[PDB]
């Protein structure tokens, strides 16, 4: 018998034992997340410990089937996922060390707090304290104090630990046969040995960089519009030709520009469409919301929720009985058991979230027939892209009319649509240069292309250059400003937010194409289109068994990340922004700073 | 007088593991197949070589009742010309099968919080079962070229695995009870007849 057919026998035994053990951990974790008690903490950790230990042994066993000898790529993929080594390549002194660095950085961040310089008793945490300032304050000096205190008090602590983290992480990556920790993260996109669908880790840097080049016109025009509006709100503080000060962007980092809407709304007299009141008038509850989401998926040819979904989900806060963890989450426990955990409220926001979350469930259900280790999004950006396109369709006025939350005699005017697209872009478009630039700095730091005595120098050079944002006060190399953001100090890769964003509009454009939608892309509702449902499903059911380049090609007819659908969605805003900026500078000079 | 004891089969408290499926001979009795067939109880009722509706009009030499538990999504394998772990390694129906496959969801009886693990199935076997063969052996299955003795255990496997039935599982993973009725037609006197043909 060949090594391949030995490997398939080993995988048969792995799958049967894995599915039941993962399920028990999923149950314990469910019980904690829906009923917080010390006892359920213990169960959850016991079951998670057993699961982890089982995966460690199976990884050891799978090491005996060398990939060379496997032709079947469905088998190679499962074995690949099992024989990954991660931190086990490290010595146990180094491995224990890096875990300490990780846990210290995480606790330094979540416990970081800053105090009034005058009163050492009035102190704030990032959440809710500082965030609330950075989201609502119109006072330049107070926004500045919160922006600077966070980075000097938490960031300076993180700086020595992050330098050590880079060394160890890079060592791990090399011992796993990657060039460095960044190359390690780009592995999520790698495809080898599938002719005409391969994709190298380095190609991600170039495809991100080439697609960013095409977003620059739209970004620059958004920037110039926001900049002019911000000069009104902060009169003496902003140059019409320079970068935006980093502390005026509506959150602690400028990750999104969402909270600039109040300062930049194009047509302040036109209220946005919010069906919350209508839902309350019509006596909707959480059940009705999720029934409506279920109707939406069936209308495109997808299955109903399972009987178990309705019996086992937690769709409302249990309140006086139990304490629950209320983050909306779509759970795939295995063994046909799909659930949603959500403390639903009767709002338009939660109506849209339910569609999002139920889209995760649809993905999960469609690829349950794949072998255990292949039940996942085709890469790290797919799941959230599937969830987001569900909100798009479900929030359009066309859709809300159809379900009786907008009156049959309601009409969208030019100005409301521009308000909507502007708001959309502050969140969606504004984060793209932020996300690209941050990850580029990390990729370069991991590659050793930025020496330690230039970390903050190059960080703020790239902020000014790529993002159009300038530090309000100078920062030397005792700062570690990138680590002042959760994802950096907590060791999560970041380019996923860029790739997923482009994916979601690629998906929507193709699905709306299939539904024969007419008019601007941002107005499309795919409901009642089984041609769109089938196109989605052809990708959903793949899970992780195919190259993500192929899974993408199933939906959109091409193999590449592509920003044109995003630009299409925003075209009415682009042209409008171009008209607004006709008497403005478009672009920025890196030379200006608030402290020069 | 001598109505066939289907209640002993269908309403039996214990059901066998599929690899060790249970057989009951049905002889010398009248059978109202239409009482079963018109039941809200059953989720599968498929007959082969015989019409389900005209069953009460037929006679047979002997009738056999095979019964066992499997997963919901494995019921499709209890049919002629199927393949899969159950059909190949546990219970195999012949291509010329004459009889009915009957199945019903037993989640309420055969699941348990924390999981019921008392039902087993053969996962590995050197070759496929011939139709109506039963294999209850427990030899170590050797997948590699090295042997399975007492020091070498690599690429060796125990052949039976337990189902794990928790009540929260999806329908395809829940336990289903199965009764396969074999209607055998020898050159011999009938012993099992529908109500319509009761005067033998
Ligand atoms: C993953 O690492 C192993 C060696 O690391 C040990 O085994 C792991 C399963 C885990 O238990 C760690 O904690 C251990 O430190 C590599 O094993 C080698 O495999 C080659 C064949 O490629 C073989 O010739 C060597 O004898 C093995 N070396 C040792 C020390 O056992 C394995 O290849 C690594 N996997 C990958 C994908 O790189
Ligand atoms: C929540 O946990 C407590 C343990 O103190 C238990 O008594 C209660 O039944 C649990 N609730 C549910 C819904 O399981
Ligand atoms: C890979 O193996 C699976 C299961 O063993 C099988 O269904 C499939 O046809 C095989 N594919 C190839 C390309 O060998
Ligand atoms: C879908 O079709 C039904 C019946 O044809 C209709 O009543 C409903 O309003 C439609 N919904 C949408 C969103 O088009
Ligand atoms: C099993 O029991 C129910 C009620 O106890 C009965 O109505 C049904 O007919 C029984 N099944 C058979 C095959 O006798
Ligand atoms: Zn999501």
B144–A27 C-beta distance less than 8 A: no
CA distance A437 to A415: 33
Nearest residue to A72 via CA among A147, A129, A3, A123: A3
Maximal C-alpha separation, chain B = 66
Q: What is the CA radius of gyration of chain A?
A: 25
Q: Is the dihedral of CA A443, A447, A449, A450 positive or negative?
A: positive
In this structure, which residue's CA is closest to atom 12 in ligand 5? Answer: B7
Residue at token pair 């601007």? A520
Token pair for A280: 């309350």
In terms of Cβ atoms closer than 10 Å to its own Cβ (0-12, 13-18, 19+), residue A129 is middle
Which spans in A187-306 are helix H? 201-233, 261-264, 276-281, 286-299
Residues B29 and B72 in one domain: yes
What is the whole-number distance in angstroms between the Cα of residue A360 and the centre of ligand 6? 7
Instruction: Enumerate the β-bridge partners of residue B14.
Output: none
Looking from the CA of residue B11, the nearest atom of ligand 5 is: 1
Alpha-carbon torsion, ordered A294, A299, A301, A307, to 10 deg: 20
Show residues of chain A in contact with B164, CB under 8 Å.
Answer: 20, 23, 335
- List of residues 6+ apart from B150 with CB closer than 8 A: none
A357 noted as active-site residue: yes
CA distance B167 to B175: 9
B154–A338 C-beta distance less than 8 A: no
Nearest residue to A497 via CA among A509, A487, A507: A487
Sequence length of chain B is 200
Residue at token pair 């059911």? A541
Instruction: Enumerate the β-bridge partners of residue B180.
Output: B66, B101
| Residue A327 marked as a ligand binder | yes
B143–A64 C-beta distance less than 8 A: no
CA distance A544 to A551: 9
CA distance A455 to A478: 10
Residues B143 and B181 in one domain: no
Say which of A294, A357, A380, A546 is annotated catalytic.
A357
Query: Given in angstroms, what resolution was this structure solved at?
Result: 2.5
- List of residues 6+ apart from A167 with CB closer than 8 A: none
- List of residues 6+ apart from A583 with CB closer than 8 A: none
CA distances from A29 to A33, A49, A590 (A): 6, 12, 50
CA distance A205 to A519: 34
Cβ-based interface (< 8 Å): residues of B facing A: 115, 123-124, 143-145, 154-155, 157, 161, 164, 166, 168-174
Sequence length of chain A is 596
CA distance A85 to B10: 51
Instruction: Enumerate the β-bridge partners of residue B22.
Output: B67
Q: Is A338 helix (H, G, I), strand (E, B) or coil?
A: strand
Residues B99 and B137 in one domain: no
CA distance A457 to A515: 50
Show residues of chain B in contact with A10, CB under 8 Å.
Answer: 143, 155
Contact between A536 and A507 under an 8 Å Cβ cutoff? The reply is: yes
Q: Tell me A69's DSSP state.
A: G
Token pair for B112: 């348990």
In this structure, which residue's CA is closest to atom 20 in ligand 1? Answer: A63
Residues B101 and B76 in one domain: yes
Where do the domains of chain A lie? 1-596
In terms of Cβ atoms closer than 10 Å to its own Cβ (0-12, 13-18, 19+), residue B134 is middle
Q: Tell me A258's DSSP state.
A: G
Show residues of chain A in contact with B157, CB under 8 Å.
Answer: 9, 13
Looking from the CA of residue B36, the nearest atom of ligand 5 is: 13
Q: Which domain holds residue B131?
A: 115-166
Let me know the angle formed at the C-alpha of A265 by A259 and A268, rounded to the nearest 5 degrees: 125
In this structure, which residue's CA is closest to atom 1 in ligand 5? Answer: B11
What is the whole-number distance in angstroms between the Cα of residue B84 and the centre of ligand 3? 14
Contact between A215 and A432 under an 8 Å Cβ cutoff? The reply is: yes
| Residue A210 marked as a ligand binder | no
CA distance A160 to A157: 7
Residues B93 and B180 in one domain: yes
Q: Is A200 helix (H, G, I), strand (E, B) or coil?
A: coil
Q: Nearest residue of A to residue B161 by CA position?
A: A16
Show residues of chain B in contact with A308, CB under 8 Å.
Answer: 168-171
Residue at token pair 């209850």? B136
Alpha-carbon torsion, ordered A429, A432, A433, A434, to 10 deg: 110
In terms of Cβ atoms closer than 10 Å to its own Cβ (0-12, 13-18, 19+), residue B126 is exposed
Residues B159 and B91 in one domain: no
What is the whole-number distance in angstroms between the Cα of residue A60 and the centre of ligand 1? 8
Let me know the angle formed at the C-alpha of A137 by A133 and A142, rounded to the nearest 5 degrees: 75
Is omega for the bond preceding A339 within 30 degrees of 0, making it cis? no
Say which of A223, A383, A399, A487 is annotated catalytic.
A487
Experimental method: X-ray
What is the whole-number distance in angstroms between the Cα of residue A43 and the centre of ligand 2? 13
Q: Is A378 helix (H, G, I), strand (E, B) or coil?
A: coil
Residues B27 and B86 in one domain: yes
Q: Is A174 helix (H, G, I), strand (E, B) or coil?
A: helix
CA distance A506 to B102: 48
A 10 A CB-CB count for A382 gives 27
Q: Is B66 helix (H, G, I), strand (E, B) or coil?
A: strand
Residues B119 and B157 in one domain: yes
Sort strands A244-245 and A469-470 into parallel, antiparallel or unpaired.
parallel
In terms of Cβ atoms closer than 10 Å to its own Cβ (0-12, 13-18, 19+), residue A280 is exposed
Ligand 1 close to Cβ of residue A91 (< 6 A):
no
In this structure, which residue's CA is closest to atom 8 in ligand 5? Answer: B7
């Amino acid at each position: 018998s060949t090594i391949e057919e030995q490997a398939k026998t080993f995988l048969d035994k792995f799958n049967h034992e894995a599915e039941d053990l993962f399920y028990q951990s999923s149950l314990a974790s469910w019980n904690y997340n829906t009923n917080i008690t010390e006892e359920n903490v213990q169960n959850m950790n016991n079951a998670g410990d057993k699961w982890s230990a089982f995966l460690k042994e199976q990884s050891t066993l799978a090491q005996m089937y060398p990939l060379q000898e496997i032709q079947n790529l469905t088998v190679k993929l499962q074995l690949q996922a099992l024989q990954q080594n991660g931190s086990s390549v490290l010595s146990e002194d180094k491995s224990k060390r890096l875990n300490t660095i990780l846990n210290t950085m995480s606790t330094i961040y979540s416990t970081g707090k800053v105090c009034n310089p005058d009163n050492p008793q009035e102190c704030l945490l990032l959440e809710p304290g500082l965030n609330e300032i950075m989201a609502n304050s119109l006072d330049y000096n107070e926004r500045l104090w919160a922006w600077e205190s966070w980075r000097s008090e938490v960031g300076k602590q993180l700086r020595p630990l992050y330098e050590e983290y880079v060394v160890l992480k890079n060592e791990m990556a090399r011992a796993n046969h990657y060039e460095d920790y960044g190359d390690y993260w780009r592995g999520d996109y790698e495809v080898n040995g599938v002719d005409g669908y391969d994709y190298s880790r380095g190609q991600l840097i170039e495809d991100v960089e080439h697609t960013f080049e095409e977003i620059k016109p739209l970004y620059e025009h958004l920037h110039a519009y926001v900049r002019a509006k911000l000069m009104n709100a902060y009169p003496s503080y902003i140059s019409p030709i320079g970068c935006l000060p980093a502390h005026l962007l509506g959150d602690m980092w400028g990750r999104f520009w969402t909270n600039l809407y109040s300062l930049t709304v194009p047509f302040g007299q036109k209220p946005n469409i919010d069906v919350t009141d209508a839902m309350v008038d019509q006596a909707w509850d959480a059940q009705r919301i999720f029934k409506e989401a279920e109707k939406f998926f069936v209308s495109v040819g997808l299955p109903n929720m399972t009987q178990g979904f309705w019996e086992n989900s937690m769709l409302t806060d249990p309140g006086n009985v139990q304490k629950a963890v209320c983050h909306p989450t779509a759970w795939d426990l295995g063994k046909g058991d799909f659930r949603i955990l959500m403390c639903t409220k009767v709002t338009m926001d939660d109506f849209l979230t339910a569609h999002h979350e139920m889209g995760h469930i649809q993905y999960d259900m469609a690829y349950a027939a794949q072998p255990f280790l292949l039940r996942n999004g085709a890469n790290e950006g797919f799941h959230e892209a599937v969830g987001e396109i569900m909100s798009l369709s479900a929030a359009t006025p066309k859709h809300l009319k159809s379900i009786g939350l907008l009156s049959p005699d309601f009409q969208e005017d030019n100005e409301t649509e521009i308000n909507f697209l502007l708001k959309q872009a502050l969140t969606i478009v504004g984060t793209l240069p932020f996300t690209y630039m941050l990850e580029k700095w990390r990729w370069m730091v991991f590659k050793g292309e930025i020496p330690k005595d230039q970390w903050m120098k190059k960080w703020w050079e790239m902020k000014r250059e790529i993002v159009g944002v300038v530090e309000p006060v100078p920062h030397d190399e005792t700062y570690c400003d990138p680590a002042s953001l959760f994802h950096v100090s907590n060791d999560y890769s970041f380019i996923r937010y860029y790739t997923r964003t482009l994916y979601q509009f690629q998906f929507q454009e193709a699905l709306c194409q299939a539904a024969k939608h007419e008019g601007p892309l941002h107005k499309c509702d795919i409901s009642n289109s089984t041609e769109a449902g089938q196109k989605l499903f052809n990708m959903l059911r793949l899970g992780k068994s195919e190259p993500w380049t192929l899974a993408l090609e199933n939906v959109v007819g091409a193999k590449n990340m592509n920003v044109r659908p995003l630009l299409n969605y925003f075209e009415p805003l682009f042209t409008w922004l171009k008209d607004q900026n006709k008497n403005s500078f478009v672009g920025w000079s890196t030379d200006w700073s608030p402290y020069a | 007088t001598n109505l066939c004891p289907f209640g002993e089969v269908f309403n039996a408290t214990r059901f066998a593991s599929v690899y060790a499926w249970n057989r009951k001979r049905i002889s010398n009795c009248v059978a109202d197949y239409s009482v079963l067939y018109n039941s809200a109880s059953f989720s599968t009722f498929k007959c082969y070589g015989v019409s389900p509706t005209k069953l009460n009009d037929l006679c047979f030499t002997n009738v056999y009742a095979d019964s066992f538990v499997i997963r919901g999504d494995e019921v499709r394998q209890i049919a002629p010309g199927q393949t899969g772990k159950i059909a190949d390694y546990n219970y195999k129906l012949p291509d010329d099968f004459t009889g009915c496959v009957i199945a019903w969801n037993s989640n309420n009886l055969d699941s348990k919080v924390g999981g019921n693990y008392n039902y087993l199935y053969r996962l590995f076997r050197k070759s496929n079962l011939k139709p109506f063969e039963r294999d209850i052996s427990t030899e170590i299955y050797q997948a590699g070229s090295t042997p399975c003795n007492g020091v070498e255990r690599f690429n060796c496997y125990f052949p039976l695995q337990s189902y794990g039935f928790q009540p929260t599982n999806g329908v395809g993973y829940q336990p289903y009870r199965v009764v396969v009725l074999s209607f055998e037609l020898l050159h011999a006197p009938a012993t099992v007849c529908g109500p319509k043909k009761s005067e033998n």
